[PDB]
């Protein structure tokens, strides 16, 4: 369940954060592939 948080607007962030909720109980990582940008963010060793 992703939400993108913008830098600024009272919360300066270093380049912004892609927030997400996940249901899995496994200690994995989450890839967020963005095909048009040909960019992908990854949360390595993401929290449950």
């Amino acid at each position: 369940y992703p939400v993108y948080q913008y830098s600024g607007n009272t919360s300066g962030l270093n380049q912004g954060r892609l927030l997400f909720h996940r249901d899995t109980t496994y200690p994995s990582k989450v890839e967020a592939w963005i095909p048009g940008a040909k960019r992908s963010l990854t949360n390595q060793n993401a929290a449950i």
Binding site: T25, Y26, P27, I48
Partner: protein, 49 residues
């Protein structure tokens, strides 16, 4: 990862299993007699441990 690992309703890995029961019984029972006593549990049944 204990809180992510749920077990079958009757398996050796379960806390409510007879293995778990055995584990508790031994852990406590073993100290009922002195280690140098002829009646010491481990002496009587070393295969148990």
């Amino acid at each position: 990862g204990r809180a992510s690992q749920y077990v079958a309703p009757g398996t050796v890995s379960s806390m409510f299993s007879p293995a778990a029961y055995l584990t508790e019984l031994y852990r406590e029972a073993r100290n009922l007699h002195a280690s140098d006593s002829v009646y010491y549990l481990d002496t009587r049944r070393p295969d148990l441990k």
